[PDB]
From a paper:
First, the MCM helicase is loaded onto duplex DNA as an inactive double hexamer. Here we use cryo-electron microscopy to image ATP-dependent CMG assembly on a chromatinized origin, reconstituted in vitro with purified yeast proteins.
Structural analysis of the double-hexamer-to-dCMGE transition indicates that three sites (Mcm2>5, 5>3 and 3>7) exchange ADP for ATP, whereas Mcm7>4 remains ADP-bound. The ATPase domains of Mcm3, Mcm5, Mcm2 and Mcm6 provide most of the leading-strand contacts, which explains how the double-hexamer-to-dCMGE transition leads to selection of the translocation strand. On the basis of the cryo-EM density of the untwisted lagging strand, three flipped-out bases can be confidently built, which are stabilized by two conserved residues (T423 and R424) located within the Mcm6-specific insertion of the N-terminal pore loop (ʻMcm6 wedge̓). These contacts are found in the dCMGE complex but are absent in the double hexamer and widen the minor groove, which decreases the superhelical DNA density.
Residue numbers in the entry:
A (entry chain D): 53 to 294
B (entry chain I): 2 to 37, 48 to 200
C (entry chain F): 2 to 94
D (entry chain C): 1 to 58, 68 to 146, 159 to 194
E (entry chain H): 1 to 208
Write the structure that this text describes.
Amino acid sequence: YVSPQQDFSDLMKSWKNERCSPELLPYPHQLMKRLLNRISMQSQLIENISMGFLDMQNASNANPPMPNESKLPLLCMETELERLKFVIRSYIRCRLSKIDKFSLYLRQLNEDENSLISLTDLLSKDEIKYHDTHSLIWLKLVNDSILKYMPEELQAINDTEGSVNMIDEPDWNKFVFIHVNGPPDGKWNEDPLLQENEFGKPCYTVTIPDLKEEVELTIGSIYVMRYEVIRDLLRDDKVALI
Amino acid sequence: SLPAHLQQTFSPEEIQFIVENEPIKIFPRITTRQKITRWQLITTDDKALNNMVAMRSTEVVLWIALLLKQQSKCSIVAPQWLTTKELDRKIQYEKTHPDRFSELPWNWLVLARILFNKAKDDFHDPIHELRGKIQDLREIRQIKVLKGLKYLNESHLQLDNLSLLEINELRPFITEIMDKLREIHTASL
Amino acid sequence: FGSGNVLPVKIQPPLLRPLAYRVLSRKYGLSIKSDGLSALAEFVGTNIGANWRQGPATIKFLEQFAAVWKQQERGLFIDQSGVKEVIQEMKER
Amino acid sequence: MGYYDIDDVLADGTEFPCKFQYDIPGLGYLENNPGRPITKNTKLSLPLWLARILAIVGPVPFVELLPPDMFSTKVMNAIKTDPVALDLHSINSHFFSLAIKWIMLFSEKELANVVSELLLQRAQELNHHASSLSIDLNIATSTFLLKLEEMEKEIYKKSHESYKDTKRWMFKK
Amino acid sequence: MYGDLGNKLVLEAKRTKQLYARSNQDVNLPMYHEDIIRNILKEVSNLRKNTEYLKEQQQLGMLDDKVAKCQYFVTLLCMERNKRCLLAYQRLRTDILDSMAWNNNGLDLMSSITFSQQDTNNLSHQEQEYLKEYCDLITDLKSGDLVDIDLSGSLVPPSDVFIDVRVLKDAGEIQTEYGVFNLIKDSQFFVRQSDVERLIQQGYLQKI
């Protein structure tokens, strides 16, 4: 770590994985904190130079900031901050929409005792407040509008035993485009999953049980593949959603 | 995010953003070497930008290069693949092998359009010839994509060297067709 | 909102508008008109002593001015009434 | 299994033939005959949200599902002979959803081999018509888009919109 | 039979979806369907009465159990179908409302100045209430940890530092950070894109 370029690379890869994935990916808690702190300090910095340039100007009708080696640096600061803010905004709003889509599923996950998935890790605190408030508001709306005139036998908005399941869950077999990066950093011999093939670079192997077949993914090729069989590789950065 | 589709596919402008987030080479027309205000960037390394000398080759990110060429303080050198010779080699490779895609960079269309729009003077070859060659390549790639679309199934596909824009313009059709085929197959089990 | 300072020094709004802009236009609210900006100079100059390098005071003043515009419907542009809403604010306390 | 999907709700309300296997009084509004009780071995067309469940609860269930008219041998032969020219809209506006439903209730490998081929052969024409962006300086498209299922129109709209946006961004001056 | 009316309601939803799908600009929801909804309410109430009557008629022991089970199942299924139709309609209308609420930079929508996209009387009272709390939720999101980032900002990437803009509606002088814009109608500006995003979003400026 301790590299501002890698923070931006990680944010971009997280955003790209977020847009194309069906599920609700875990929240990178530390990266967001570091980026927000960096933005907070940087905005203060540009404000400081702006104030310093403004105050001296009015004092004794001095010349403005001399144009050479002056305007372009500060303009670059502003535009860079603008781009970074846009990227984070798009990431946050996309994940908020995905939270909206899967409210009942997340509630059922949180209510289950024997579930390793917990909302304290998968959901940010502000996202927790959003989920709780939106669920209550929607429940109030539906209860006031429709559900009050219904028999006590069926008055639940979540019914897993009815004719049609009322709790929607993510599609675990959606087809996605992936690119095979290989090892996240290097040391191709270190990775145990890598296995060499004939007259070619080492390729990963996966199995499709419903089809009952073995599929080999060669490094440097783009594939259209099921999402479930590639979850571990994406979690370990071996593959990247395009 | 939510409005105007955007749920599961990128817009062309976002693809352009990703393309402009990539390095490029330039010839500075100004000297900002430290004496014997500074850039201090937070998402890109500023070592090259701080240490600049005129009439020497350096590399920076693309959008800074466009911002500099908006003024008169830069001159972007087009990549070596943007030449008539290197394009004619790829056209021949494309003709000879009718079952594989040629090895072009994953941003060739977007980079070509951006460079033709912004840095028109920097090219050495006449620009109309290159513009014709790009269309000549695109048509053949479209023919190969049309032939390859026939082999759709429920298991997996491989598109080894397809470009980013070509993948983006074809994703919604391909994904949905294979999804429907997969549901039909799964139902019968 | 307080009194007893040294004296109301007069300063031009040019050195006051950036803080008001960042607090109001960017985050929540907008349209600080020129006449309204000049009006918002007097009350902040009433307690001007040892400020523009201080801590919370100016930010809290802008927060309180925003409170009226969330409470009352009002509009977008800020006009010579800007003192009229601070009269309401001092009525509240 | 989409509770809030509009198209699934619509397609799930189609009428299928069926036969009562018991004799029961009190019914009759199914036949629009209020007072008349239903007899045994009576053939009526019931909606799918009812006939699906009535064929499971009983052992022998209360009602038997009869072969549909949209899955006859004539329709299969017409599908096999010429997939593109066939008018699936006239047969039923929700052919595919009901097809997967029928495959799910009754495991039929023959139908899964025919519907897949039909979809695969119609996808090529769908792509051909979706990729044809007009240039300013045909009867085929108008004829073909009137033969499209409800599901296929969504795919056509998505592909067409994506192609138009790509072309618009490429030639923006 | 019993649910045949509710299908009509679902059909209406489909039409609204098309207006949502084929929308170059923001649109307005059509009139509410309180009369159809009240008709489903009446018929489900009648179904409840029928279920009660079946309960007593069975518990006096005049009818066989196998016979009563069938009409019990039929009434239950009809009520379930009616619930499904009503919930689907409500969720579609709710989603469109949420989209509009997000696409107005937060704010209180109808109480304050609105972009005139929607009339007051189209929405139901419960929908009007729901919109208010949803807007408050957006508001206290925007004041969370993500203060610096404007969660209600523009969603098109920035790629042009300096733009040409034209004023659509007349206005007075507006102060901006380190300067002033004078909004004389039929006048053109050449200025940075960041300064005029707010004014373009609110309809006081044209072009980009």
